[PDB]
């Protein structure tokens, strides 16, 4: 399972990449607007993320019409080969995915909330599809059940579109995604950081330290 | 999963093909008769649909006897190589499917209401079998359970006949067909258009448009 | 399981009542506005249904504020004892239900789309809660799964609010509702008409008639 | 589970009542007209069965309209207190069942092929409902699934209508009915006889006889 | 679950009755023809079993016809109030069970091999029904599955007939009967003795012994 | 299922109670410290919540020793009959619950993370037990599974201690709690507010409004 | 679920009783022999445990023959009315249980390793049956599955013998026993103390203490 | 499934190796510090184990920082080709594993307590991951459920990291690990010793010996 960071905060992205556990980044207009404050331009933020991340970087069109979408997608693709164009699940978005797929431009279909929307995006040729589990949780439906159905459907037809679980809110979204077999999760930085941690890991490290001081007062392994 | 349009309405077909999510079309005598009004003749309708649709176009015979069915089927086949001849599940229909199968004329067995009818159509060599889920629902049995049994039977024997779910009435027939792994669904136009829609998709677009306007007064992505 | 008719069409209601299988009626503002045309007044339509139907008849408030809902609910209640006041699942609606329940005015909470909304309506004291299965099907979620969860939740807490399955589109919504154990279904007229029918019933009647004609022409 | 005989053949009925495992009888116009031959009349056949069978005896109306159904039913009822009026699942039949139940006349709703038809018959007050499992098998659906759903639905609503499994064709329809918990099965005579039999029973009787002769010639 | 001994052997019955865990006895014509050899008469063997065993003791008729079975059953009844008359699953057996039930004579229907035979016996009023699990195992059918179905059917109809699992061959027939909830099992003596034993019981006794010898 | 509000913010508590959907409140030292800023005293905050909430109000001891715990619990009980004393799962806490139970003071055992801790608190006589589902989610275990086991255990022994699901983070914690059959959930205000809402409720209200304007231009129901 | 302490160590028993979560005590000849050293005699140990523990105290006979077991059991019964006589699953033990049952002397059948042994002990009238889960685990079969089958058998026949899970080695034997619905567990002291503990409980205490110090410098709740 | 011995006790390791059933050894700082007493030096203990054991031998770094872990790992690797460097699941540990994996130094990620930590270690390229089942049991969670999830996750993504079940306390951890399909278990000596044994094995040997003594005294 690939793990992407879902943010536009450059500091978070730098830190996650240095742990070596971040395989890419997803952005959206809200995440970018959060960082385009106090002089910082959205164009510079996007270019910078593409620079520092070796994996895929998803960047969303802002046009809602077919022609604006494919025009902006070709501009986004032009910025770096790791750019992936995020496109919403709409009539015009499906048309844009089909065109861009034929042009060998990688695409990510976003704002997906049920399995048949995800299948429609796969049939248009999309590279990734992003179902939003946290926003389903918000409206009182267990969002992970949609991921489970998409995985089954994609397995049934040997679909090569990658399932990219998005709107992740907690580590159990991540655990359940891995058990189901989703291709990718994209996670906020706070969630990323929590995935490495466990209180028994902490306790065990402290007990090992104390036992080793019995045999080596300076606490080193001299071999 | 392939998605066919279940209509003889030229505008619906043109619209859905323009969307890029329609892989073919199924008709029947009732659907054609509803459009063959105010001067239009059934032969114009069929030829025009064959022209618009690149994928399979299923066209039903009206004869009930073997010789008439095979004669009709060869005429239908002559209208275009994407024509598929729709034949009912009857003794003379099975005989006709076996004859036409040997002539490499593609066939679609219709009016199928249980799994063993579907198996017999596959054994006659039919290209597609069309169980009618909505008409089973009408008589108080869950039609999707027949699709599930057909999928299992066909998997058991590596049957190459495609399961073409028909009499579809709502998007959950479509969801369940995909989770089962049916090869094709054929859907009325009202159903097709609904498949792309979700209220959280609309809500999410509106929020992203608002976030975009905070960083770009005009509303145009400049990269 | 009680079976209600989901329409404001007086002709449908008369026909279904004469068949003996209709236990009540549900309406909503769209259903009424469809009939209240070409001179027909919405007040008359509501009053006519209340007179024809012995069982519960649900009529929806149109106000969105607490005070306006309670005022409208009292006028609806005053139209006949079988009137039930349909109230949407909103903050003001839950307050209104709580007040009307203490006034012993029967209530039906509508526009419910998940099980926790249904639970909230039950906690407000509502007589019926109406989850919409067909509108969930519309958006690619099997609506009957919400009915199954509400039945479990209501059984857990011995909740006396009745589950009234609404937005029904086909007879398998009805079948699944009965197997789950919902208290009520409300069905459109073309669904109601199909529930008595089966092709093997028709075939068996024809065979029995031919058999009888051999012994008594 | 009660066990009824599904026949109009008086010799079968007498033989099976002589076994003491038959709790009642069902008939239909086809079964009666098979035995109404060689100058035998359908009225005498019915009266003879009623006399010989202590249990319920189901006898089908031949009218298709409500008023004819109800007049026939009362005449059937007047033939003996153990008569049960068999009425088809139709709009007129449900109306007739509702009337007859209020008159304390026992009823059996027949030609039922799915669980919601069975529910409608129970809501009309019917004493027994008869889903036809074998005719469902004939058209490629496992008929016993319908029995299982009706048992669940009736349990959900504490329905007192008895499930009377009909159109029975083999002993596994009977076994599955008992495991599900159907109230009654009605079986043809050749199925009834087979229910007592098993090859290991016969083989065991032979070995016990053979061992018995060892110690007692 | 009640536990009966399935034998005509006076020594086995007496030993198991000494252990305090045997609740009743079943016999059959083959079991009794094995003990009625070299000067033993079947009549004495039955009376001695009846006398030793407080609980129910089933004794099978040998007649095949209704009249003979009912007359034999009354002779069996007259032998002791704890006598239970074992009657095979046949037409005349079902008629005899019904008559004997009306006379308040306890009955045990035997040679039952599927659940619907068991149900018919219950409908005739029988006190116990004895499905034969080992003989089903013999012909390649897991006989405990018939017990499970009979339990479900009897539960469905609140049937008061007791399920008496017979033809028991091993301790897992016994375990599965208890997990299903059969009312009674009847077991041969080899099987009965084995039910108390386990090698970890033996090992634990020796270890407690050794530990106690360090203190006394 | 009772629904408590998990906050010490007086405004949130006032608002939730007026919806009539709030059955009580839980607090803890962190939630109270958040509101004891800029002159406001913790004692006044506690007394005020007890005043405005008719249902149970859980207030946590801060002593870690048996004697300090029962002393503070008797003070908390003295403030109002709706006070419930929150006591942590520790050796001294169990001893305190047993004493206070014998004094007919209602208790809530908190900081519970597995089912056997919850059983121990029930055996001491505690009125409520509070397993922390969100903090289990944080450490990569699905916290709702512990609620399911506690419900089973309590059912097995007819335990009268109420299960009060705490550390709730989203509406699916609430949904799963209700399906399991927990006695109580305690929820932050943001979660509470989301429970009433659904996008199809919004859309349906707008459609009903529009249809009614066809028959009543002023949008009233005149009867 | 009742919790007994499985030890003859007086200090452990005193400590665990002081905690209020111990409902009784089980011993055996090995556990007593480990404490009957350095002058202490086995009779002092038993009498002292009987004095400390208000609940049942199980004390094992050492005879292997029926007459010795019943004579020992009457002496044990005379030490105090909370004494329960532990008797092994043997032919003479079953005879002894039946005799003692009639004398209204409470009994505990030990060295039980399968469900039918447990059923036979119940049929002899035993008060408690003690299957040994850890010793089954030692020989490669999951001992808790025997507890599960015993619970089902006893439920089937409304058996009043209490299931007393013994040879407990870890807290998951305890968890599974409670989820199954065993009547009693008996646990070594090391296991008992661990049952209350969880690292997130400790972490949560520490955070609440910190939040408290922000509003109360001394550290005392004043109401 | 490979079976490792989880100890630094040279006598246990010698004994287990001579039995032929030990495929490798795991150690940790507590296990080594227990043996490195009364003159015994930890360097000598590690070197002696590496010589005795043909299979993998895991030895844990004690540094907590990236640079110190990699330096210590290189010294461990240099002690013998069968050495495996045990690295805790921390941020610095994952960086260290990634570097050592690219240097073709085998690694074992330890102190893992849920399935997503195990996945992170696998993504860093670790040769073995060691989830601790017994320490989870300690805190009231069935540790074997984490092994089951990791096996599923690893199967989903065709992960080549081996699952090394650690903190094993009893033979049922071992049984359940094999049924799940874990790659490796590491067991303490008293668990290892019990795996070959069964009381019915012992009893059957005694019976066969008595049988043989009847034909060849
Ligand atoms: C041809 C077979 O695929 C189709 O056109 C079918 O006739 C229709 O799908 C049947 O649908 P209705 O039951 O709604 O007529
Ligand atoms: C009232 C609630 O019981 C009913 O009239 C509902 O508004 C309708 O059942 C909803 O149906 P549609 O989704 O078909 O509008
Ligand atoms: C009356 C309803 O209980 C019965 O006589 C039914 O008509 C028959 O059981 C139907 O059987 P066939 O399907 O074999 O006609
Ligand atoms: C009487 C009925 O309970 C019993 O004696 C049975 O005949 C035997 O249990 C049958 O045993 P076999 O199959 O081993 O003969
Ligand atoms: C008496 C019966 O409950 C207990 O003391 C048991 O002897 C022990 O629980 C057995 O435990 P070990 O297997 O650890 O000796
Ligand atoms: C190394 C990881 O494979 C092992 O030595 C582990 O540290 C131990 O297996 C952990 O065991 P304890 O929980 O018993 O310390
Ligand atoms: C791109 C789609 O993969 C992502 O940036 C999504 O927009 C976010 O993951 C959505 O998350 P929120 O629901 O929390 O905005
Ligand atoms: C009292 C226990 O019911 C509550 O106030 C709990 O402390 C909180 O629910 C814990 O939630 P957080 O984990 O989010 O602090």
Describe the structure in your own words.
The PDB classes it as transferase. The entry lists the keywords alpha-beta barrel, conformational selection, domain swapping, transferase, TIM barrel, schiff base, Large-scale motions, Substrate binding, rate-determining product release. The entry is titled "Transaldolase variant D211A from T. acidophilum in complex with D-fructose 6-phosphate Schiff-base intermediate". In chain A, 50% of the residues lie in helices and 16% in strands. Chain A is an alpha/beta fold. An eight-stranded parallel beta barrel of chain A has the order 1-2-3-4-5-6-7-8, surrounded by seven helices. The two termini of chain A are 37 Å apart. Chains B and F meet through helix 11 of B and helix 11 of F.
Topology:
This is part of a larger assembly, with eight copies of chain A.
Chain A: E1 2-6, H1 10-18, E2 24-26, H2 29-35, H3 42-52, E3 57-60, H4 66-77, E4 83-88, H5 91-102, E5 107-112, H6 115-123, E6 128-131, H7 133-138, H8 144-156, E7 162-165, H9 171-180, E8 184-187, H10 189-195, H11 199-213
Parallel strand pairs in A: 1-2, 1-8, 2-3, 3-4, 4-5, 5-6, 6-7, 7-8
Helix pairs in contact in A: 4-5, 6-8, 8-9
Bound molecules: fructose -6-phosphate (8 copies).
Residues 6, 26-28, 58, 86, 108, 110, 130, 132, 134-135, 164, 166-167, 186 of chain B line the site of one fructose -6-phosphate (F6R).
């Amino acid at each position: 399972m690939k793990i992407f960071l879902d943010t536009a905060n450059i500091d978070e992205i730098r830190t996650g990449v240095n742990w070596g556990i971040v395989d890419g980044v997803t952005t959206n207009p809200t995440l970018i607007s959060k960082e385009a404050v106090n002089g910082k331009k959205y164009g510079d933020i996007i270019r910078e993320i593409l620079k520092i991340v070796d994996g895929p970087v998803s960047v969303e069109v802002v046009s809602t019409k077919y022609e604006g979408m494919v025009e902006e997608a070709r501009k986004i693709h032009g910025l770096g080969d790791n750019a992936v164009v995020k496109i919403p699940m709409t009539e015009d978005g499906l048309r844009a995915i089909k065109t861009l797929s034929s042009e060998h431009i990688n695409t990510n279909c976003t704002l997906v909330f049920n399995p048949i929307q995800a299948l429609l995006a796969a049939k248009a040729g999309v590279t990734y599809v992003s179902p939003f589990v946290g926003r389903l949780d918000d409206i009182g439906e267990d969002g992970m059940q949609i991921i489970d159905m998409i995985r089954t459907i994609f397995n049934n037809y040997i679909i090569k579109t990658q399932i990219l679980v998005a709107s992740i809110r907690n580590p159990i979204h991540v655990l359940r995604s891995a058990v189901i077999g989703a291709d990718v999760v994209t996670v906020p930085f706070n969630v990323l950081k929590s995935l490495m941690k466990h209180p028994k890991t902490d306790e065990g490290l402290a007990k090992f330290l104390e036992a080793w001081k019995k045999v080596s007062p300076d606490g080193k392994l001299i071999l």
